[PDB]
Amino acid sequence: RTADLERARLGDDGLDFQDDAAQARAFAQGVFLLEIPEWLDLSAGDRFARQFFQGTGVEPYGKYRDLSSEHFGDELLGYHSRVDQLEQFLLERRFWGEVYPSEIATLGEHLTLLSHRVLRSVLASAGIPEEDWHRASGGCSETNGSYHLTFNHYRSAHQDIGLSSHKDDGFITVLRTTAQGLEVNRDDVWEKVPVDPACFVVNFGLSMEILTSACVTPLSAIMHRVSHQNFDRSSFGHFSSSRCLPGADDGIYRYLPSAGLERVCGSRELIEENDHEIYM
Ligand SMILES: CC[C@H](C)[C@@H]1NC(=O)[C@H](C[C@@](C)(O)CO)NC1=O
Ligand SMILES: O=C(O)CCC(=O)C(=O)O
Ligand SMILES: [Fe+2]
């Protein structure tokens, strides 16, 4: 079975769904489709996702295979081979200008500002006072969050699930996928996410679920996975998290209606605990 998702577009007033009920369903499901702006070139990102794992013999992006987590002082970044079919290149915004090719950093900036606009629509729909958005979002209601532009390749020769079931860590994931494999578990049945290369997939992460757990319409971090791939597959995603630097962590908060924000845990703590549960 395949999920019937709502489609939205960024317009003059923010996220535009077909109607208010459609937006309600999309937000309650925790996953929806977002039209890719026509001016936005994704071809360099798509090529990077197809090449990053192939090593320095493959121009212009294969060389990023050689950049392991040590080159960054942050074990989460660089090239990672996972226990599932997936292998990844992960890089946080603070390194894009220095480390990514210039056109890949440009892509990451476009996606940051786009995700910024998406997140502020969601925050307004949740009824959180505007002056709490910055702390509630760890800077992502502006542009001071932590942002990962992450590229994925599924090694079909590996006899694993493509990517185990998990929820994302942060507030918003903007996912660029062009092939089948992504599945979501809204309402206790797994469903394929329909493929539409003219749309991003948008879903919420654990920090959105924590943030809104006490609101009148709590939003959920959708459980999703990538089924076992018989041929190779690639994708990439822009992930927005509470500012989670090694030295400067913005914290994870739950909004208490009529009271304010209360601290739950750290942003890096959440990413580490989540990343443990997925792969072990
Ligand atoms: C360090 C992860 C970063 C915060 C971000 N947050 C996610 O939740 C996913 C995690 C995943 C499943 O892609 C790792 O394999 N990706 C990302 O880039
Ligand atoms: O490759 C995909 O479609 C999903 C990737 C993903 O869910 C992730 O990296 O967290
Ligand atoms: Fe994910």
User: Where in the chain are the domains?
Assistant: 7-279
Q: Which ligand is nearest to the CA of 235?
A: 2
161 burial via Cβ count (<10 Å: 0-12, 13-18, 19+): middle
How far does the centroid of ligand 1 lie from the alpha carbon of residue 166, in Å?
10
Give the tokens for residue 68: 């392991």
CATH architecture of 7-279: Sandwich (2.60)
Question: 3-state DSSP: the chain helix, strand, coil percent, rounded to 5?
Answer: 30, 30, 40
Q: Are β-strands 31-35 and 7-11 bridged in parallel, bridged antiparallel, or unpaired?
A: parallel
* Residues, the chain: 280
The secondary structure of 183-203 as a DSSP string is EEESTTS-EEPPP-TTEEEEE
The candidate with the shortest Cα–Cα distance to 199, out of 87, 40, 52, 45, is 40
How far does the centroid of ligand 3 lie from the alpha carbon of residue 21, in Å?
26
User: Which residues have C-beta within 8 Å of that of residue 12, sequence separation ≥ 6?
Assistant: none
Which of 48, 224, 275 maximizes ligand 2 atoms within 8 Å of its Cβ, making it the mutation to test the pocket?
A: 224
How far does the centroid of ligand 1 lie from the alpha carbon of residue 237, in Å?
9
Closest atom of ligand 2 to CA, residue 150:
9
Report the alpha-carbon distance of residue 31 to residue 16 in Å, rounded. Answer: 15
Report the alpha-carbon distance of residue 244 to residue 266 in Å, rounded. Answer: 8
> How far are the Cα atoms of 33, 79, 173, 249, 264 from residue 269, in angstroms, in the given order?
29, 21, 19, 9, 10
Report the alpha-carbon distance of residue 47 to residue 96 in Å, rounded. Answer: 17
Which residue has 């702390």 as its token pair?
A: 135
- 3-state class of 67 per DSSP? coil
Report the alpha-carbon distance of residue 209 to residue 31 in Å, rounded. Answer: 13
